[PDB]
């Protein structure tokens, strides 16, 4: 575990502590939850707020700001929803399979999110992903590395410079691999790196399902009205 990679882990931890509020104080600013697509204005506000936080995290990733402005946008458009699902694992609890954010009120279950349309085709695999991510019992250092590796992916559609993206991801991947050996003891570290990259593959199919869900729902202007301008810009055309 080198000079350079302890620097990286310190940066990502601080970046996360600045972009994820464990007290969830800003939830008062959202449009109120009502439990029709009753919850969508509240969840749209939650997602929109979370995209801002994901962007703030991404900008602090060592090597990210050295990318083009255009490559940064490509990486955030494709990765935003995936990092949101990753970072939501902190609020997700396995007592009742819900995201618990202080009150409830601000706690969300499958009935809160899968009532309308074909959204269960996304929610059922997403809950299973949350359970699977939770059973990894990640160190916080591993949690923030995985989000950063998720953001800086060289295979996102539309990436121009990919070698540099790969270079930035490799230095994060090799930080995660070396961290698991030196800091994660057995048996919890057994194939832990392979199980984490597997969760990156789960995010890809959850992202693909998400794009199909969003496209169908945004196609109805009545529901697109309830979203936010940021959400529409990022989850785009």
């Amino acid at each position: 575990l080198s000079e350079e990679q302890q620097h990286i882990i310190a940066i990502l931890l601080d970046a996360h502590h600045k972009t994820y509020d464990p007290t969830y104080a800003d939830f008062r600013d959202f449009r109120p939850p009502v439990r029709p697509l009753s919850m969508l204005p509240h969840l749209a506000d939650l997602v929109s707020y979370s995209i801002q936080k994901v962007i703030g995290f991404a900008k602090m990733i060592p090597g990210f700001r050295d990318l083009t402005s255009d490559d940064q946008i490509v990486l955030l458009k494709s990765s935003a929803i995936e990092v949101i699902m990753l970072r939501s694992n902190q609020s997700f609890t396995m007592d009742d399979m819900s995201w618990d954010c202080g009150s409830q009120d601000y706690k969300y279950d499958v009935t809160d999110v899968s009532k309308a349309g074909h959204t269960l085709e996304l929610i059922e695999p997403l809950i299973k992903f949350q359970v699977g991510l939770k059973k990894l019992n990640l160190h916080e250092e591993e949690h923030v590395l995985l989000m950063a590796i998720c953001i800086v992916s060289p295979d996102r559609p539309g990436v121009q410079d990919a070698k540099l993206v790969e270079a930035i991801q490799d230095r994060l991947s090799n930080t995660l691999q070396t961290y698991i050996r030196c800091r994660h003891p057995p048996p919890g570290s057994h194939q832990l790196y392979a199980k984490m990259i597997q969760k990156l593959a789960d995010l890809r199919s959850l992202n693909e399902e998400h794009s199909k869900q969003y496209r169908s729902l945004s196609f109805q202007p009545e529901n697109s009205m309830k979203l936010t301008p940021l959400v529409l810009e990022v989850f785009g055309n």
Binding site: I55, I73, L76, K77, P229, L230, E233, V234
Partner: peptide
């Protein structure tokens, strides 16, 4: 073509 996202970068 992403005014808000570009502004959230810098």
């Amino acid at each position: 073509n992403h005014p808000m996202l570009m502004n959230l970068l810098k």
